[model samples]
Target: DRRALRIGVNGLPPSLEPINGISNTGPRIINQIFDALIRRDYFADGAKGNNIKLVPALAESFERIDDKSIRFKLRQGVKFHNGAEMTAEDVAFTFSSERLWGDVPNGRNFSPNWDEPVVEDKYTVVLRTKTPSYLIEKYLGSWLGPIVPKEYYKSLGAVAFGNKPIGTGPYKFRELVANDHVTLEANDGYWGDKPTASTITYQVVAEPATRVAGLISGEYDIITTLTPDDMALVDGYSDLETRGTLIENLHMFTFNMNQPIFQNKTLRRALALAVNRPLIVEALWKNKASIPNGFNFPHYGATYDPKRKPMEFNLKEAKRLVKESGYDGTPITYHTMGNYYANAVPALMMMIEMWKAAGITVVPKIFAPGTTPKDSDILIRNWSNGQWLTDGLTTMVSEFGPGRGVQKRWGWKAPAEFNNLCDQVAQLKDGEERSAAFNRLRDIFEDEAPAVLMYQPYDVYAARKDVQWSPVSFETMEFRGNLNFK
Candidate 1:
């Protein structure tokens, strides 16, 4: 028991391969089983709230050659889980157009524009941006960052390989039981700081009460998605304690424009205006979380405007918009995945009641994760800003850019004006024009309301007092970085 760590989570992502799936909770295993070329120095400059400063990970050192390219010196002897030596060729293959950026099922949505990775030598790699992009290095450290064993992946082909991922991470995937658990063992050959626990087991408990019980009974060393209400229950045990932090992900509702009613901008604004976010934060989060001013973050460096305020919640204005929308009494389906998201159901219920107060009809419906909600009128989902770059564009690209996370899932598209502004913001890194484009982008976002920006939420967990750890804001489970069992 001392050599292993048992963690209870809400759910597991549908795919283990970097290019196969995108989920809010995917990082729990991704960070363990894969390594990025570069990583945010979270332990140092990347503070708890908003910072995307980078540090060498797989790469020993990196140099920016010019506005369009970066040269990297790779660690000489890193090995993938498959016992294959990692070299510049493997790094090149990992980012190749056919692998992470090609027309695969899920890769394009997350891929940034880049030329094929250039291998200078066995332990040297150079990357060139398609244009003079500021995100070349950031993209390498984002979700698109996980490096794969080139030969191993080609051996099994894409579909077969995604089912079994092999990388040069601190832990190796041991075994997986769908919807039950996935086990990982420490990679003794890890090139970096080795994993603390010899074995790590992540179990899907779905129900928060069950997860809490497992933690209190010592069946689980740690359990995630503990609600604010669960805090009191866990506090009853003298040997149990709760820890949490506001993650970079924002919980919001995206409308399916396939529904004629939601297409109306007036109705969308009313939906945004009706929610009392602070009340929900206090009632459900117990003030553990704060409302994000908008899609922008403080990590945006000079482009971040401090004067931005939280989304407006005005009942009077909401009613006025509802009247302006000319919406008939239609039962809009609010899709949910139970408590897959901590307090997601409660939050949806609270928001729907508020919508009802403003003359909107919203009804709840349940569905499994990873399945398309074809008939769903709106989806209550979360999107994370990994902040691969300090510019506000990273957050925008996450939810709004072409084929990005939110758009692909919501099956919704913004108007041409919004789309054009998003591209403009991405192209300009930091300057007067950049700030102007970004500010206008937010303005269009609020005015159009393709989705309503909810408050930033927390990822809470309960663990035995012997487990010395804190939740990471970047959405990763730090079994090696900060976890230790006494």
Candidate 2:
């Protein structure tokens, strides 16, 4: 039986290297050829659309043993594309600073703050972090997660391995004709569930309409990157379905520490209270967007706090805080981008009005190309981040972490508490203790108000109903259960 599936995409990914190749359709295709130690909880129920829960993949089960380390029990029988028996050495070398994250192997340091993996046995290994890296699972399970054969990689080096990548995934790489097509065949000896499709091809269509048109004619079973406006057109067909997710990125306002007026905690909390975040989404984004749960999305897996609330609108409290702060009408310069974000002008106007109503003064400023954000008191920014990890480290720590940060460049200093908590969170794993620390940190952070989270954006995709498929994240395509034929 020639059970096959063809996905029509606009373009192709750059490289097949697990660490380097990530963009457009890179993860979607490379994901077919590799397996990460931790994966989104897609296997539990074949649940669709941005599965956030973290589950074991190459490793059968993983547990955080202490503040600085985690233990992974590898799945014994998993086989690579080249039939190499997966072992702790492979896992160790896969993450060793010498291999992927240090001066060696082209100085590719994904985990500069971490020590190398120590092999306990053939199928056991421990990942120890030299620095705070509690959210290590995300990286281990992210675009950088797929475990490669240690000897194979060392033998061929990076180029050859990327040219013909292999992993414990359900699909093995077959051919990659640049700017044309990349093909894969089912891995018969796959450790997890086997793929129904014997062969799959991601072909370049270049045009969205053409891809959709091909799907209509059954020349393609699925199409990538559909617009929300285009969803109805596809759903108009009884035989097809529209699946989508808001994977990463948030547009928010950040405060400059050097800005004298924002030094008052009462003042910052007032500004946060004055924000009608839900209203902003409704008025501007319509039904196409969602507010980030503080610094969270359920796709963050275990660290996700469904009970944790974002900064709620409390204009009365805002007014009180404004008065209590004894704010002298100093200019609260709202440094923002011009027409960069969706409905930027309207959103800015509404925020200004809300602050004004709360007895706070605001002066609007626009940041354009080639300009410095020096004079900006409150800078409007967008972080199109990867929520590939379990915690808020990527965006939160990245933007507000230690010495190196965009905020730092703008003279925006991090709180001792913020930095300390960042350090603590980095070391501690996802559990009750970490949760307590996290809640306290965010609680203090939201009150201090260095930045107020705005909104997360989403994308839409289309495929035939018979495929029984749903998107896992923005780029990752699950072949075991997420993709199937009727």
Candidate 3:
């Protein structure tokens, strides 16, 4: 048997269920155990050789049948991990099964457009949308679009399914030690190129320094979320290498707009102005991260406006705005967790000092990693902007749109103007008209300041030199089928 490739991550996914799992750690696990209809090509396409473009995975090909529907022809001879043959019914069940209702958070982005899945035959299916969505193909290929066997899933249910997930991926689940590690074995029956590694053990190493030590000491073959400053440690070893790219991730403090204090948009804008983004990037990220000019990444082509500027840091202006907003020394509780993001707590600690200097009383609350702060006044969260304009738009709408968005989580209610623009942008064909609508949406987001837009951080990682790996543009650290065990 070949040596097991051990990966050290800051945290482990709570569940292996693709639809139920929502954390970054979850996808890394899910990608290894499941296959989507389409997948992002991480090895090629961009000028830098790291662009995120969709390619066929489970579905041999997909095309538009009409303005509101697209048909997919499933790849023949594909088999789930459980030995069950994959079919159009499985793909249909993944998107439309009532058993998975509220379980598929990824569907939230395309759900507005989704109507129903029509299985034409054993290996062909059609997905109908409420309206013509130009970005439907991209949605189907996203990280949240892994297909599951309908018969297998129904029999296992959520509990048994989470313990042993069956998918048409390159790796099969072996064991999961809660709060410790997850072990996966290579699927020799893989439909595509065989995986190079025999086994992969995702070992939990919450501390960055510990992960670095594990890699250098030969305890880990791969490690993720490597602090930019820790690259020096890997550089010292000839057998270690790092691979990463500028990801579309925003590290910021998300506020509960329902709170009386946050209802004052002026106060929210003041808080944004008080934090020095450039200083945080320099100190915590070693200048590797880019300061966010707006909610969406500038790489989104014409949809993103380069001329737009982020809120400038002005202590005097911050104080003036805070006083004018009738703030009578009410302590603003900021909730966060450690080890999830490199220097997240430390960066917020710096932010607290800056706000204090601006004559604002702020309190810091630390919670366990992966804990959602639905009850907090303000919570620190890293929101990933999509690679495409539509991808980014869908994420924004899911988090901030009214009724459709999780109002209780972020207390976000997109203005009618913003909502109308989203619908308008969705209907228009990809061109100047759609681009202009997105630009207007960004302007509205900047003006509202519903969530503080922090810096765009790099998704950094380090692996043993012989073990080749690289994270995709959307912050996916896949290894089973992608990485080469040299």
Candidate 4:
């Protein structure tokens, strides 16, 4: 490697589709390619999203003593990649455009309905939201709200910028070699401290086998999502290394609640009882998972009820409930995402076998990434949020519910009662009100059985012992943040 720093990882950016928009992985990916006026502190090394904290990025500090207003203090003399001084106007421009025209991933369209972000002074800015929303900081930290170079975006449009994005982040876009790697050079004009590496490259290496081999052979410095077989395969190679956690939140077999097969609560409960969670956790995951309830973890706090024992793997009870619900032994397809989850192949096969033992035919049908399910009766889907919070609950409501409510992350509209509860939670300013609201959704999800709650799978990787890294977690492999190669 000719660069000052060489990094390796599995999987490259999926698409260079209008990163400013929400359609492609580009929306989330742009945060690396671009910079925002205010980014989540988690982007820095000290903060963690699961802990629910935020710090400044473009802004040196931010405060909002009043109910509806927020102010940011910009750092002195930050410059964009293209050599222009980053000013408060660029922040205003990003917020305004993203709100009205940007594709906000989670229905978070801020500009269209807000009270306008005003530039209070040269280095200061203020935002007046229409209502009392504690989510303002979270909204600002949204990957979609980055302060892209207004001049660049205007001239190049969203598509052109996908490949040639201009940002004030540590890395500036070099070239996106399609189906290969996206390269970048450090921005000496970056507002913060200079990065250790002069150049950075994010290689798009798909396929578990290739990725694992690349890492072991020193072709890649890192690899993600190593299978148990791969783990065993790499048992004792001195040059190779492996690290994993027993805690991950991916790959759950969900049912279409709207369909008659899963409309009955008894049947859902029975299915839960039929599947042995601990065993699956032990066998398929190599005992690397936590017992999940509903859709969230203990990070949601009061939303998680300790009394709710996960579905016990009880075949007899599963049969009883299946019979009571009058399933009539209709063959159901369990739609699974082929490339979406790392353990999808074995876990899905295990589910089909387990359900068959309970006299239910759960034929596993794997779909390509981004492919929606068709005539399948059951679907094995994975919902992973690198950061943990109430946002996880919102994710479930949108996918399983009718959609369009606070819970609606997908395009579906939610039922009135369901939507109302989610709305209440979204508006509540933390404490008792938020907890009460989340509990309602949790109870409803468990009772209705629209989705089957599975163990949270940890995002795992292997790095050489010489590599010193910290809490890289599931969200992004921000290897450069806490890493200092010894």
Residue-wise lDDT of candidate 1 within 415-461, one digit each (tens)? 78778887676566678888878777888888878777776677788
Q: On a 0 to 1 TM-score scale, where does candidate 2 land against the true structure?
A: 0.69
| Candidate 3: residue 471 lDDT (0-100) | 69
**What is the Cα-based lDDT of residue 395 in candidate 1?**
63
Misplaced by over 4 Å in model 4 are 1-10, 13-31, 36-52, 97-115, 142-145, 232-235, 245-250, 255-273, 301-317, 324-331, 337-339, 367-382, 386-415, 479-481
TM-score of each: 0.93, 0.69, 0.92, 0.81
- Alpha carbon lDDT of each predicted model: 0.77, 0.72, 0.74, 0.59
Full candidate order by TM-score, most accurate first: 1, 3, 4, 2
TM-score of candidate 4 on Cα atoms, chains taken together: 0.81
Model 2 spans > 4 angstroms off: 22-24, 43-55, 60-66, 102-112, 131-143, 177-180, 204-207, 245-288, 298-383, 398-400, 403-417, 428-454, 473-475
- Write candidate 3's Cα lDDT for 281-381 as tens digits: 88978888888666556545446666766667788888898889988987877776665776777777899899998778878777776556566535334
Model 3 residue 371 lDDT? 59
For 328-382, candidate 2 gives per-residue lDDT tens digits of: 8876667654433334556778898888999887777766533545545343343
Q: Give the winner by lDDT: 1 or 3.
A: 1
Model 1 clash pairs? none
- Candidate 4 on 337-444: residue-level lDDT in tens? 554466766776777677878777766676654444553334334444332232434355434544332123322223467667755654566676666566667767
Between candidates 1 and 2, name the one with more favorable lDDT: 1
